[PDB]
Every structure is written in structure tokens, then in C-alpha cells.
Amino acid sequence: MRLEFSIYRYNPDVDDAPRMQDYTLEADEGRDMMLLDALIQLKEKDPSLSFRRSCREGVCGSDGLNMNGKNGLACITPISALNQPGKKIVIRPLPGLPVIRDLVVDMGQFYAQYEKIKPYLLNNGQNPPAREHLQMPEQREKLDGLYECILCACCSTSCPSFWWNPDKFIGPAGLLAAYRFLIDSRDTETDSRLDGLSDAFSVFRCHSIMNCVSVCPKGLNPTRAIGHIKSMLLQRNA
Amino acid sequence: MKLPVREFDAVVIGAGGAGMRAALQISQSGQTCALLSKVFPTRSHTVSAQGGITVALGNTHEDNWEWHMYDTVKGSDYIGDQDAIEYMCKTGPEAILELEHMGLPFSRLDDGRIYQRPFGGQSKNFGGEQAARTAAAADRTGHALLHTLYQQNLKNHTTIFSEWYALDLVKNQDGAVVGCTALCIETGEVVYFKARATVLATGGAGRIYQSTTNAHINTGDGVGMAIRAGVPVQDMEMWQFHPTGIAGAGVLVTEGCRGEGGYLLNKHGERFMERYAPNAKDLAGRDVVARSIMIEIREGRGCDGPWGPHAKLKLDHLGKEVLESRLPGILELSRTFAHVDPVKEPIPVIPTCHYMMGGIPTKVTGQALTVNEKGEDVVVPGLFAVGEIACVSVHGANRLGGNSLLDLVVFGRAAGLHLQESIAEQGALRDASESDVEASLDRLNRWNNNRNGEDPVAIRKALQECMQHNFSVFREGDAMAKGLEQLKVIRERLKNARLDDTSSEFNTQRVECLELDNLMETAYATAVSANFRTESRGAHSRFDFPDRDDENWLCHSLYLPESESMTRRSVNMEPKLRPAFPPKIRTY
Amino acid sequence: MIRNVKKQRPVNLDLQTIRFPITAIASILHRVSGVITFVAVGILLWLLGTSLSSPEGFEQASAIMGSFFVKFIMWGILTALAYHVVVGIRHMMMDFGYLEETFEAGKRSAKISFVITVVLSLLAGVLVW
Amino acid sequence: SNASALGRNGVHDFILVRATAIVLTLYIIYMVGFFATSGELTYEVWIGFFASAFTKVFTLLALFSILIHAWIGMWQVLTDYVKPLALRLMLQLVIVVALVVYVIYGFVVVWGV
Ligand SMILES: CCCCCCCCCCCCCCC(O)O[C@H](COC(O)CCCCC)COP(=O)(O)OC[C@H](O)COP(=O)(O)OC[C@@H](COC(O)CCCCCCCCCCCC)O[C@H](O)CCCCCCCCCCCCCC
Ligand SMILES: *Cc1cc2c(cc1C)nc1c(=O)[nH]c(=O)nc-1n2C[C@H](O)[C@H](O)[C@H](O)COP(=O)(O)OP(=O)(O)OC[C@H]1O[C@@H](n2cnc3c(N)ncnc32)[C@H](O)[C@@H]1O
Ligand code: HEM
Ligand SMILES: COC1=C(OC)C(=O)C(C/C=C(\C)CCC=C(C)C)=C(C)C1=O
Ligand SMILES: O=C([O-])CC(=O)C(=O)O
Ligand code: SF4
Ligand code: F3S
Ligand code: FES
Ligand SMILES: [Ca+2]
Ligand SMILES: [Ca+2]
């Protein structure tokens, strides 16, 4: 059938303020396609339209967009889930983050918070293994749901706490990654890591709103991860 | 002099698996280095890798690197260098455990339904190996490996230039590579990155087909830059089509499936892979298993449906648990794209474009080579290549499953560990006149002034289509002939192609266009090569020449560029090593 | 644009443009319920003040409570207060472990909460009367 | 350690909010239980309820827990919406005074009965 789209547009050198532009992409009513597919087509009709994309299979994190009020990956959001007769398909950039052009936002502040929490293994080196480190399946199991983050920022983008404190409150993705190392048998700086998150903003700005769980493409649960970090803190500072 | 400059003792163009492993190593050596990327490093095609890393660790069972050599040499068809493969397989373990010490989320061993063993990296059974030597971390080993490595460049504070587009290399009056030019996608400014060493790691470019497992980013920018600069490409017709791509989707599904015990069946309920490779079964090599299913489609005996002529990849029989603990990433791509839960029904798989074994010829240290007037190997001053963009001559004519990743790390690190030494050797390299620099800006200026030209979408589409038909799994002289001409038609066409967006703030089009040229030079080289070779080896299958030419075609076809001037084709080879090795019969 | 330096990038922050889960509504109301209550104590203290000062005082308070407009306000306070306690407890329960941190488990918690709130609100209204 | 925040650090604020929340919940039930067992409230019954050492001590324990609790809470809210420093400090000041007065007035009312 036909498809009426509503897309966010903005170009620093032409526009001086954002606008929503109308689009119609008459597609074959044969099968369902992802929203990226639409966009690609539309881009053929209109070149100026820019946005990010790559793996195309929901594994790179490039196409994070807010579709009809909800954040997701354009590469795996079926047009079925977004089509309602008479109404337009509103596609906008991720909330909160600055807009570089069209649907492309500056992810700067996002990666920053990621770095603050030290996204890498810390092993004092005391007790070197012969070959690889000792990691029993039961210990390695603890990392599930914590190492699959693809840094799409759908979660953080959906968190009001993160809107008010982009640079003070770490945010969903970063705490999920902090936890990945906090419970990693191979990491030896856990207590040191916990002292670095005891301030008032780093973690405690989380009010358990659960919008982050709501939107995760990978089905990850930052709220639950943040709940365990809070516990660790209580054990170490009380 | 109006163009900005950024001096580094090195420039690593590409943030893939290999590009970061090198940028890391080069930095450990106290060498100033800039790392560039078209996308944020974690989005490179490597994140998509599944299967795992095949390396002889001996966890799953006792093993030696030599068995890794035999499994791999016969895997390439004695078209892959013994010297290089040796080095890789041998240096394999140490290099991988290194990654675990960096915190890589490997799967672990101990208790399972009917299995049991210590904390080693879990090694899964894979195609081309007598037993299980594939270290895997769930279905997402690439994602684990790519993220770890990024986390590492975070710790070691590597200078990263995210979302910068490298255009063309910049040559020295003496014909040396001295850095390159690149575009800041964000602002749109252009800059010349001058360096005493310019490392290319721009991945493959399977985008020159209509159905590939690769991403929209794999456009062979690397290949394009090499040719437009003067550098050849080895075995640029050797393309491995993955056996289990997804019918109608082109999205990949791990060979690990067969590894964990997956069936590759036909509608008549027989396991045709058992009949084709009577004793090796589904473990059969890459090149071989592809033609098996693809054939069943030629005879009108291939399964069909909404998705299209496919082959059933039965896995349901395995426990839903095992599938969720070992292949979580698979169980979703199938439902998401194939609308079929593998826990209960097989998967509509088909051989689709995958790894590109061809690419810039290099020594083990990663240096780029070109031929001499006589036809002798001559290193290229200031240029190195690692990853898929490089044909170090390791996979030869058939890349063994899980060896690419092992390639990335080993040779990515190899280039790093040797960089200072190589520079010493080439010596000092002289500056570049604005003329040299200006030259590289040509491709850009062209596109930016030409606006009434032709629409690149068609050119792009055509290009992929032709390659798809005339250079598929099976091909023949007459075919290449037509395509090879069609291409010239299109390559001229592409010269008047236009650029609609002339903006600065993130111009996706301008970027995509620039990538088109690379698609063009890439596909071209692929053809002139494909046609040339007179034998049916590894991924190369000609109905006209069904047997491999041991005497004539046991060599590396060297595509001879001259930039945009007229082309040529030559040869190369490598039988000597340490433990020794003879060609033979290839029965999988 | 500071002085002699331009262009500040826009941001997508139109709330009517964003779709919020019921869990997101639950917690922002808990926040709004707290500020209402913060002010509420002052009003109750005032009343408590009058109420005990002396008989004539108790009378004057008994009559102010008489106004139905005041009855309506005394009603919003108790409702806001009740809401805040219920969601607050839902909150403390997830923190410790008497409630799943899963999304579904969260939406169900939020719903049961509003339900108990409305009921208490009703009780509150019977009392005000 | 943020000067406006009561807590020396985050974990502190977490606890103090939870601890006061529990105490205040008991107190509310206590006061609610009383009203739902009164029907027609007589000046004799009202003053009788407060002239009780127990009701006096609980009522002042709640007021004190409100100070600590609303302090931290109002502080969190302000940290999110009032970004201009000068303005926010004025508010925190108005709020902490108001809270302190609530407790002092509490004392006055209580010993006066
Ligand atoms: C588990 C979680 C716990 C929940 C926590 C949430 C708490 C908030 C929710 C509030 C719920 C209230 C529920 C009340 C209730 O249940 O009402 C009951 C109704 O029950 C039914 O309908 C039966 C149905 C059964 C179905 C199964 C009893 O109601 P009655 O029948 O007595 O009706 C009044 C009557 O008409 C006869 O009425 P009257 O003529 O006697 O009225 C007289 C009127 C005027 O008297 C005065 O002038 C004195 C006023 C004194 C005010 C004192 C305020 C104290 C402030 C202390 C602050 C300390 C910091 O009286 C008023 O109408 C009385 C108003 C009472 C307001 C009470 C609120 C107390 C809040 C205390 C805690 C504050 C905390 C601040 C932080
Ligand atoms: C597609 C694919 C491949 C794959 C796999 C699954 C899929 C779906 N599973 C594998 C497996 O289990 N085992 C294995 O050994 N290999 C597997 N592969 C293949 C493998 O992914 C690739 O060989 C490997 O990823 C290649 O890595 P490399 O680092 O060489 O390349 P890349 O990851 O594609 O990244 C290239 C980088 O270069 C940047 N780039 C490219 N062009 C430019 C320009 N012009 N300017 C600046 N940067 C450029 C990219 O942005 C990227 O970072
Ligand atoms: C004295 C009456 C009360 C007042 C004035 C009050 C006020 C506040 C304020 C202003 C906040 C912070 C707003 C926010 O950041 O969401 C808050 C949070 C909270 N309150 Fe209360 N409160 C009161 C009673 C209670 C009671 C009786 C409980 C126990 C059920 C409670 C439990 C909580 C909890 C758990 C939070 C945390 C919310 C978060 O961190 O987002 N409160 N309160
Ligand atoms: C838990 O969810 C939420 C918040 O809390 C952290 C918010 O802050 C906001 C934003 C609120 C604004 C701009 C108005 C605030 C108003 C008052 C009366 C306090 C929203 C949408 C929200 O969903
Ligand atoms: O490329 C390979 O090594 C094979 C692979 O990833 C897979 O089968 O999933
Ligand atoms: S946790 Fe989920 S939503 Fe959040 S950044 Fe990672 S993949 Fe994206
Ligand atoms: S939405 Fe934000 S407030 Fe916590 S529960 Fe998720 S990180
Ligand atoms: S393009 Fe990578 S997840 Fe959508
Ligand atoms: Ca630890
Ligand atoms: Ca290669």
C-alpha cells in the first residue's frame, strides 16, 4: 500500500530551527519491511535525508531512532508495528541528545559516561594464570545480559534522569557496563570501583522508572543491574 | 597551501577487529598513532561475527597447531602460503589468551548434560577442522571481541578519529605512501593525515552483490584506494560464499550450528552433504558445501516458499536449552528475519556472499607489496594492510571457518610488533607537493561540481546485479566476458554520476557516493581476475574448467593497476616453510 | 550563541512527542505527590495548631473543616499522601527484593498501586466527610 | 559531598530516606487508626489523644523524620529542575527553614497541650 511518513529534519546551514517533513513511500503491499528499508528508499527520492545504519541486523547499534514516541532500531522495527491508517509515521531523533543533522544525534555525552565507569578489565596481576583465567560456567553465567550491550543508547535516551544530568548521572547503559565488571570474577578492583560510584549522582539518580528496560532492543535490563550495584554499595558502605 | 595537516608516526585506517588490535600494539610501542573510522568503532562489520575463533588451545581436547595447518592448507587448496599460515596457527594460542587477559567474555567449560572439563575457553566443532578447536563465546564472538578491543583502546588512550572518511592515499615523488586524506563526516572539512606508516584495515566489500552477509558499510573503500594509487590486489576473484546465509535476507547464520550438530537437508529428507562428502559430512569445507545445496536448486530439487529456493538447516532436534545457551544470537535472527523458530523448525539457508579472500598482498609483518619490472616483489614505502582488506595469502582460495578473526588479531598485532623496524628499513620518506595532496582530492572535487550527471542508485544497482549473475558461485568464460564489458559501460557511466546533497553537517549521500567509486574499482578487479583464471579451485568454479590446474594455475593472480589507466593481470606463489607440506587430493 | 560565537544544536524534547510507559507515570506522580505533601504538612500543622490551642480553637477548626471547598483540599492532600505512601512502598520493595525488577512485574506493581490508592482516596473522602 | 544534600554521600541519602519512610509509615497508620475509630470527635477526645506522652513523642519523631526525609527529597527534585545556582540555593534555604520551623512549632504545640 501507500505509506505516509512524518520525519524530523534539520540542517544548521539551511534551517535555523527544526521541522517535520512529509513523506510518502508507495511500497509493494507484498510483505513487511523494516523501517530502515523504507528510509533507504525515501533517501533515493530525497538524498539530503541523513541517518545512521550498518550491520542492518540489529547488532551494531547505529539506527537508534524514536518511532511514534518509542525508541528503537530502525533495522528491526517492522512497518507493521508502526502503521495506522489515516495517521502518519512519526520518526524523530533520540531524545535529549543534541542534533547534528536530520536524525543523527551527537552521541558524545553518551560515550563519555561510558568511559567514566572504566569499561575494561582491571586485574592487579597478582596470581597469574598459566594460560587463561579461571572462570567456571557458573561464574561466567553472571555476565549474561551484561556483555551484549551494543551501545545504541535507546535506553539512556529514554531516561528523564539522564535528560537532567547527562554528565552527572551515569545512565542505564553505563551502569549496566559498570555491573558487567563489578561481577566479573576476573576483575580485581571491585571495592575500588564501588567507591567511585558512591556519590549522589553516579547511580542514585535512578528512580526505577523502567523506560530503559521498556526499550532495549537486546532485551537487557539496566534497572535490575542498577539494583544490584545499589546493593553492593550498601554492603560496602554501611 | 590551504589544506590542514595532522602528523602521526602512523595512521590506521579502519577500526575493525584488526585495525584496533594494531592501533593498540602500535601504541604500546610508544609510537604516536591515529586511528580512523567511517562509523563508531563498535559498529564495524566485526561486531556481527558469530561462530568463534579457531585456534589450537587444547581445552576441548588435546591438539597441535600443525593439525591446524593441514586442516587449513588443504582448506585453501594449496593456494595459501605455508610460511604465513604456519606463523598464524603457531602464534595462534598466545595471541588469543592475550585477549582473554584483556577480559573477553569467552564461554567456559565444566558441567553440561553429557560433558565436563575446566575453565578453558569453550571450543566448538567447526568446518574444516577434524575436531572442535573453535573458541566461542555464545553466538556473538565478534561482538565480544570487538567491544573488548575498543574497551582496550579506551584504557590505553588511543587517539581515535571517529566517523572520518578516508579518500585516497597520498603518494611521494619517489612513489611512496605518506599518509592519506580524509573527510570529517560530521563537519565536512577535509584533512591530510601525514604519516610515516599508513595502515589499511577497511574490511571487505561484499556489497558488490545483491545478497550478502556483509553490512552496508563493506564497500571496499580500501581496495579502491589501493588501485587508484598504484597498488595491485591478489586473488581478487576468490570470494567465499557462506553455505548458510539466510534466504531472502542475506543475513548470516553460524556454521557453529552444524558444529553443535546441525543438519543441512533437502526436501526429499536426505542429508545431501552426507552423500556429497561421504565421510566428512556437514563439516565439509566452505567452497564445497556451497555448491552442494546450490546444485540441488539447479536440478529443481531445492525446497521453496515465501523466502525462496532454500535448503533446510534443521536444528530443532538439539535441545532448546543448548540452542539458547550456545546459539542465542541465531534463535533471534531466524525469527526476526526468517520468521521461523529454529527450536521447532529448520532454517531457510542458502550460500550467500561472505568473506573476500582477495586483497592487498602483504608479508607477515603486514607490509604491502607490488611487482618489479622483472616482476619481483617490491615493498611499498609507508603502506601496510591487515584484516580482510589484506591478502597475506592465508586463506588462499577458501577461508576456513573461524580463521578470519584469528587472522585479524595475529597479523594485526604482527604489524604492530614490527612497525618501528619496518620504518627503519624503508628509511626516511620525503614530503608531498600540494600537487600530490591535490591529486587525492580529485575524486572529491569531481563529485562536488558535477550535479546534472547520472543517478548513482542505478549505477550501484546494475553493478551488484551483474556481479551477482556473471560472477556467482558457478561461472564461465562467456559470462565474465559480457559482464567485464558491461562494467566498462558502467564505469564510464559512473564518471558523470551526480551528487545531489552539497551540505556539510553529516552528508550521508556524499559519503555513499564516494563509496560507490570503490564499489566500482572493486567489482572490476574482481571480474578481470575471475575471467583470467583457468581452473576450478576453492571458491572458483568454472564449468568450462572443472579441475584445478596444478601446473599452470597454482599461483596468486595479481591484478595490475595503473590507477584509472588501462589494466593487466599476472601471477605469484609460496611452497616453502618449516615443517614442510605437499599439495594433494582435496576430499572433504 | 554567546557573544561573537554562534550556533547551538537543537534537541528533541517535546514530551507530547514521547510515549511514556505506565511505570514512568507511576514514578513521576510519586515525585509530584511528595512536593504536594511537603506543603501539606504545613497546612496540617496550622490546623493542628488551632485544634489544640483551646476550645474556641477546636471549634474554629471544626468549622473551617466545615467549608466544602476546604473539604476538597483536605481531600487532595490525603489522596496525594496516600499515593506517595503506596508507590513509596512499591519502591522500597523492589529495592530489597519483594518484587521482581522485570518490566512486566513492574507494570503489574504500578497497577496494583494506583488501585490501592483510589480505594484509600475513597476512604479519605469518607473521613473528610 | 554536596553541601545542600543532607547525606555525606549517596548511600547515606538512600538510607536516611528509607529509614524515615518506615518510621513515618508507622506514625501515619497510628494517626489513621485513631481517626477511623473516632466517629464524632469531641474536644475532650482530641486533647485526650495528644495529652498522651506516647502521641506527643511519636508526633515529634515524625516531624523530625520529615525534616530529614523532605530535605533529601526536595533536594533531589531541585537538583533536577532548578539549574541556576543562586535561585536553587534560595529555595533549599526557604525549604530547610520551613522544615526546621515545622519541628519547632511541633514542640510548641505539643508542650502547650
Ligand atoms: C498501608 C498504607 C497506610 C495508608 C497510608 C495513607 C494514609 C492517607 C490516606 C487516608 C485514608 C483515610 C481513611 C479514613 C477512613 O478509613 O474513614 C473511615 C470510613 O470508613 C468507612 O467508610 C467504612 C468502610 C469500610 C469498608 C471495608 C472512618 O471515617 P468516619 O466514618 O469517622 O467519617 C467521619 C465522620 O463523618 C465524622 O467526622 P467528624 O465530624 O469527626 O470530622 C471532624 C473534622 C474536624 O475536626 C477538627 O476540627 C479537628 C481537625 C484535626 C486535624 C488534625 C491533623 C493532624 C495533622 C498531624 C500532622 C503531623 C505531622 O475532622 C476532620 O474531618 C478530621 C481530618 C483528619 C485528617 C487526618 C489526616 C492525618 C494525616 C496524619 C499523618 C500526617 C503525616 C504528615 C507527614
Ligand atoms: C559479515 C560477517 C563476517 C564474519 C562473521 C559473521 C558475519 C555476519 N563471523 C565470523 C566468524 O565467526 N569467524 C571469523 O573468523 N570471521 C567471521 N566473519 C568475517 C569477519 O567478520 C571479518 O573478516 C572481519 O570482521 C574483518 O575485520 P576487519 O577489521 O578487517 O574489517 P571490518 O571489521 O569490516 O572493519 C573495517 C573498518 O574500517 C573502517 N573503514 C572502512 N573504510 C573506511 C574509510 N574509507 N575511512 C575510514 N574508515 C574506513 C570501518 O569503519 C571499520 O571500522
Ligand atoms: C512526610 C511526608 C512525606 C513527604 C513530604 C515526602 C516527600 C518526598 C519527596 C519530596 C521525595 C523526593 C521526590 C523524588 O525525587 O521522587 C520523596 C521520595 C520518596 N519517599 Fe517520601 N515523603 C513523605 C512520606 C513518605 C512515606 C511515609 C514514605 C514511605 C512509604 C515515603 C517513601 C519515599 C520513597 C521510597 C521515596 C523515593 C523516591 C525516589 O527516590 O525517586 N515517603 N518523598
Ligand atoms: C519519573 O518520570 C519523569 C520525571 O522525573 C524524573 C520528570 O522529571 C519528567 C519531566 C518533567 C517536567 C519537565 C515537569 C516537572 C514538574 C513538576 C510539578 C515536579 C518526566 C516527563 C517524567 O516522566
Ligand atoms: O566466517 C566464519 O568463520 C563462519 C562463521 O562465522 C559462522 O559460521 O558463523
Ligand atoms: S543496554 Fe540496551 S538500549 Fe541500553 S545502550 Fe545497551 S543495547 Fe542499547
Ligand atoms: S529509566 Fe532511568 S531511572 Fe533507572 S530504571 Fe531505567 S535507568
Ligand atoms: S543497522 Fe545495526 S542494529 Fe540496525
Ligand atoms: Ca571481584
Ligand atoms: Ca582477505
PDB file of C-alpha atoms and ligand atoms in Angstrom, chain C residues 37 40-41 43-45 47-49 51 57-66 71 74 77-83 85-86 89 116-117 119-129, chain D residues 24-25 27-29 31-32 35-42 46 50 59 62-63 66, ligand 1:
ATOM      1  CA  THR C  37       2.869  16.630  50.743  1.00  0.00           C
ATOM      2  CA  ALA C  40       0.654  19.666  53.094  1.00  0.00           C
ATOM      3  CA  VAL C  41       2.372  19.187  56.461  1.00  0.00           C
ATOM      4  CA  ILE C  43      -1.277  23.263  56.424  1.00  0.00           C
ATOM      5  CA  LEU C  44      -1.978  20.349  58.754  1.00  0.00           C
ATOM      6  CA  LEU C  45       0.335  21.741  61.392  1.00  0.00           C
ATOM      7  CA  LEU C  47      -4.808  23.195  61.731  1.00  0.00           C
ATOM      8  CA  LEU C  48      -3.372  21.039  64.458  1.00  0.00           C
ATOM      9  CA  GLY C  49      -2.173  24.283  65.966  1.00  0.00           C
ATOM     10  CA  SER C  51      -7.285  22.462  67.067  1.00  0.00           C
ATOM     11  CA  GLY C  57      -9.861  26.991  68.783  1.00  0.00           C
ATOM     12  CA  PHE C  58     -11.114  23.456  68.343  1.00  0.00           C
ATOM     13  CA  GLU C  59     -14.424  24.987  67.318  1.00  0.00           C
ATOM     14  CA  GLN C  60     -12.888  27.305  64.739  1.00  0.00           C
ATOM     15  CA  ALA C  61     -11.046  24.341  63.269  1.00  0.00           C
ATOM     16  CA  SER C  62     -14.146  22.128  63.293  1.00  0.00           C
ATOM     17  CA  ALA C  63     -15.895  24.846  61.287  1.00  0.00           C
ATOM     18  CA  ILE C  64     -13.124  25.531  58.782  1.00  0.00           C
ATOM     19  CA  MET C  65     -13.223  21.830  58.027  1.00  0.00           C
ATOM     20  CA  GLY C  66     -16.883  22.647  57.548  1.00  0.00           C
ATOM     21  CA  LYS C  71     -13.095  19.574  52.401  1.00  0.00           C
ATOM     22  CA  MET C  74      -8.180  18.298  52.739  1.00  0.00           C
ATOM     23  CA  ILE C  77      -3.801  16.191  50.464  1.00  0.00           C
ATOM     24  CA  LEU C  78      -4.828  12.829  51.897  1.00  0.00           C
ATOM     25  CA  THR C  79      -5.004  11.325  48.399  1.00  0.00           C
ATOM     26  CA  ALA C  80      -1.625  12.719  47.360  1.00  0.00           C
ATOM     27  CA  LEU C  81      -0.271  11.495  50.686  1.00  0.00           C
ATOM     28  CA  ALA C  82      -1.781   8.001  50.215  1.00  0.00           C
ATOM     29  CA  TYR C  83      -0.480   7.773  46.683  1.00  0.00           C
ATOM     30  CA  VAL C  85       2.986   6.059  50.574  1.00  0.00           C
ATOM     31  CA  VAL C  86       1.806   3.272  48.268  1.00  0.00           C
ATOM     32  CA  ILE C  89       6.358   1.208  49.426  1.00  0.00           C
ATOM     33  CA  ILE C 116      -4.997   0.645  46.295  1.00  0.00           C
ATOM     34  CA  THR C 117      -4.524   4.400  46.089  1.00  0.00           C
ATOM     35  CA  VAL C 119      -9.531   2.865  47.310  1.00  0.00           C
ATOM     36  CA  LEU C 120      -7.695   4.790  50.053  1.00  0.00           C
ATOM     37  CA  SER C 121      -8.585   8.043  48.375  1.00  0.00           C
ATOM     38  CA  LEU C 122     -12.232   6.988  48.656  1.00  0.00           C
ATOM     39  CA  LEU C 123     -11.790   6.161  52.330  1.00  0.00           C
ATOM     40  CA  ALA C 124     -10.070   9.538  52.805  1.00  0.00           C
ATOM     41  CA  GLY C 125     -13.098  11.249  51.281  1.00  0.00           C
ATOM     42  CA  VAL C 126     -15.483   9.436  53.630  1.00  0.00           C
ATOM     43  CA  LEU C 127     -13.410  10.707  56.545  1.00  0.00           C
ATOM     44  CA  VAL C 128     -13.186  14.314  55.349  1.00  0.00           C
ATOM     45  CA  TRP C 129     -16.950  13.995  55.472  1.00  0.00           C
TER      46      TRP C 129
ATOM     47  CA  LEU D  24       6.569   7.800  59.008  1.00  0.00           C
ATOM     48  CA  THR D  25       4.511   4.901  57.672  1.00  0.00           C
ATOM     49  CA  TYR D  27       3.109   7.048  62.502  1.00  0.00           C
ATOM     50  CA  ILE D  28       0.558   7.564  59.737  1.00  0.00           C
ATOM     51  CA  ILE D  29      -1.105   4.233  60.436  1.00  0.00           C
ATOM     52  CA  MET D  31      -2.891   8.540  63.370  1.00  0.00           C
ATOM     53  CA  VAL D  32      -5.155   6.954  60.762  1.00  0.00           C
ATOM     54  CA  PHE D  35      -9.382   8.773  63.193  1.00  0.00           C
ATOM     55  CA  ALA D  36     -11.062   5.629  61.881  1.00  0.00           C
ATOM     56  CA  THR D  37     -12.017   4.780  65.472  1.00  0.00           C
ATOM     57  CA  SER D  38     -13.349   8.203  66.402  1.00  0.00           C
ATOM     58  CA  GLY D  39     -16.551   8.962  64.523  1.00  0.00           C
ATOM     59  CA  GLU D  40     -17.613  12.189  66.229  1.00  0.00           C
ATOM     60  CA  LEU D  41     -14.530  13.903  67.622  1.00  0.00           C
ATOM     61  CA  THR D  42     -15.063  15.797  70.878  1.00  0.00           C
ATOM     62  CA  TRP D  46      -8.996  15.221  70.789  1.00  0.00           C
ATOM     63  CA  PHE D  50      -2.482  14.265  72.478  1.00  0.00           C
ATOM     64  CA  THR D  59       4.262  13.154  66.627  1.00  0.00           C
ATOM     65  CA  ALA D  62       7.540  12.053  62.674  1.00  0.00           C
ATOM     66  CA  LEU D  63       8.158  15.798  62.388  1.00  0.00           C
ATOM     67  CA  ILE D  66      10.012  14.719  57.868  1.00  0.00           C
TER      68      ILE D  66
HETATM   69  C1  LIG E   1      -0.852   0.663  54.343  1.00  0.00           C
HETATM   70  C2  LIG E   1      -0.612   2.125  53.988  1.00  0.00           C
HETATM   71  C3  LIG E   1      -1.312   3.028  55.003  1.00  0.00           C
HETATM   72  C4  LIG E   1      -2.070   4.128  54.268  1.00  0.00           C
HETATM   73  C5  LIG E   1      -1.317   5.450  54.399  1.00  0.00           C
HETATM   74  C6  LIG E   1      -2.072   6.548  53.655  1.00  0.00           C
HETATM   75  C7  LIG E   1      -2.779   7.463  54.655  1.00  0.00           C
HETATM   76  C8  LIG E   1      -3.538   8.560  53.917  1.00  0.00           C
HETATM   77  C9  LIG E   1      -4.875   8.010  53.414  1.00  0.00           C
HETATM   78  C10 LIG E   1      -6.003   8.495  54.307  1.00  0.00           C
HETATM   79  C11 LIG E   1      -7.026   7.387  54.463  1.00  0.00           C
HETATM   80  C12 LIG E   1      -8.061   7.814  55.490  1.00  0.00           C
HETATM   81  C13 LIG E   1      -9.086   6.716  55.654  1.00  0.00           C
HETATM   82  C14 LIG E   1     -10.121   7.147  56.682  1.00  0.00           C
HETATM   83  C15 LIG E   1     -11.165   6.066  56.865  1.00  0.00           C
HETATM   84  O1  LIG E   1     -10.962   4.877  56.735  1.00  0.00           O
HETATM   85  O2  LIG E   1     -12.500   6.709  57.227  1.00  0.00           O
HETATM   86  C16 LIG E   1     -13.360   5.811  57.889  1.00  0.00           C
HETATM   87  C17 LIG E   1     -14.542   5.497  56.965  1.00  0.00           C
HETATM   88  O3  LIG E   1     -14.680   4.095  56.907  1.00  0.00           O
HETATM   89  C18 LIG E   1     -15.843   3.680  56.024  1.00  0.00           C
HETATM   90  O4  LIG E   1     -16.420   4.399  55.225  1.00  0.00           O
HETATM   91  C19 LIG E   1     -16.184   2.225  56.297  1.00  0.00           C
HETATM   92  C20 LIG E   1     -15.980   1.382  55.040  1.00  0.00           C
HETATM   93  C21 LIG E   1     -15.308   0.056  55.389  1.00  0.00           C
HETATM   94  C22 LIG E   1     -15.122  -0.756  54.103  1.00  0.00           C
HETATM   95  C23 LIG E   1     -14.452  -2.089  54.408  1.00  0.00           C
HETATM   96  C24 LIG E   1     -13.868   6.477  59.173  1.00  0.00           C
HETATM   97  O5  LIG E   1     -14.423   7.737  58.847  1.00  0.00           O
HETATM   98  P1  LIG E   1     -15.740   8.203  59.688  1.00  0.00           P
HETATM   99  O6  LIG E   1     -16.818   7.206  59.457  1.00  0.00           O
HETATM  100  O7  LIG E   1     -15.317   8.507  61.083  1.00  0.00           O
HETATM  101  O8  LIG E   1     -16.175   9.587  58.928  1.00  0.00           O
HETATM  102  C25 LIG E   1     -16.028  10.797  59.642  1.00  0.00           C
HETATM  103  C26 LIG E   1     -17.377  11.121  60.298  1.00  0.00           C
HETATM  104  O9  LIG E   1     -18.218  11.665  59.317  1.00  0.00           O
HETATM  105  C27 LIG E   1     -17.253  12.153  61.432  1.00  0.00           C
HETATM  106  O10 LIG E   1     -16.269  13.110  61.106  1.00  0.00           O
HETATM  107  P2  LIG E   1     -16.030  14.294  62.194  1.00  0.00           P
HETATM  108  O11 LIG E   1     -17.265  15.112  62.289  1.00  0.00           O
HETATM  109  O12 LIG E   1     -15.466  13.684  63.424  1.00  0.00           O
HETATM  110  O13 LIG E   1     -14.860  15.184  61.496  1.00  0.00           O
HETATM  111  C28 LIG E   1     -14.460  16.337  62.198  1.00  0.00           C
HETATM  112  C29 LIG E   1     -13.359  17.032  61.390  1.00  0.00           C
HETATM  113  C30 LIG E   1     -12.935  18.339  62.091  1.00  0.00           C
HETATM  114  O14 LIG E   1     -12.307  18.073  63.327  1.00  0.00           O
HETATM  115  C31 LIG E   1     -11.326  19.194  63.661  1.00  0.00           C
HETATM  116  O15 LIG E   1     -11.564  20.384  63.583  1.00  0.00           O
HETATM  117  C32 LIG E   1     -10.005  18.606  64.099  1.00  0.00           C
HETATM  118  C33 LIG E   1      -9.055  18.527  62.910  1.00  0.00           C
HETATM  119  C34 LIG E   1      -7.746  17.908  63.357  1.00  0.00           C
HETATM  120  C35 LIG E   1      -6.789  17.795  62.183  1.00  0.00           C
HETATM  121  C36 LIG E   1      -5.514  17.136  62.684  1.00  0.00           C
HETATM  122  C37 LIG E   1      -4.495  16.960  61.570  1.00  0.00           C
HETATM  123  C38 LIG E   1      -3.273  16.277  62.171  1.00  0.00           C
HETATM  124  C39 LIG E   1      -2.024  16.626  61.384  1.00  0.00           C
HETATM  125  C40 LIG E   1      -0.838  15.926  62.025  1.00  0.00           C
HETATM  126  C41 LIG E   1       0.433  16.258  61.256  1.00  0.00           C
HETATM  127  C42 LIG E   1       1.609  15.546  61.917  1.00  0.00           C
HETATM  128  C43 LIG E   1       2.886  15.899  61.207  1.00  0.00           C
HETATM  129  O16 LIG E   1     -12.224  16.194  61.349  1.00  0.00           O
HETATM  130  C44 LIG E   1     -11.724  16.095  60.249  1.00  0.00           C
HETATM  131  O17 LIG E   1     -12.638  15.746  59.037  1.00  0.00           O
HETATM  132  C45 LIG E   1     -10.546  15.129  60.509  1.00  0.00           C
HETATM  133  C46 LIG E   1      -9.476  15.240  59.404  1.00  0.00           C
HETATM  134  C47 LIG E   1      -8.389  14.196  59.518  1.00  0.00           C
HETATM  135  C48 LIG E   1      -7.225  14.275  58.595  1.00  0.00           C
HETATM  136  C49 LIG E   1      -6.421  13.077  59.236  1.00  0.00           C
HETATM  137  C50 LIG E   1      -5.052  13.042  58.395  1.00  0.00           C
HETATM  138  C51 LIG E   1      -3.840  12.682  59.264  1.00  0.00           C
HETATM  139  C52 LIG E   1      -2.543  12.674  58.479  1.00  0.00           C
HETATM  140  C53 LIG E   1      -1.643  12.236  59.704  1.00  0.00           C
HETATM  141  C54 LIG E   1      -0.176  11.882  59.170  1.00  0.00           C
HETATM  142  C55 LIG E   1       0.239  13.184  58.515  1.00  0.00           C
HETATM  143  C56 LIG E   1       1.644  12.903  58.111  1.00  0.00           C
HETATM  144  C57 LIG E   1       2.245  14.173  57.593  1.00  0.00           C
HETATM  145  C58 LIG E   1       3.662  13.765  57.035  1.00  0.00           C
END
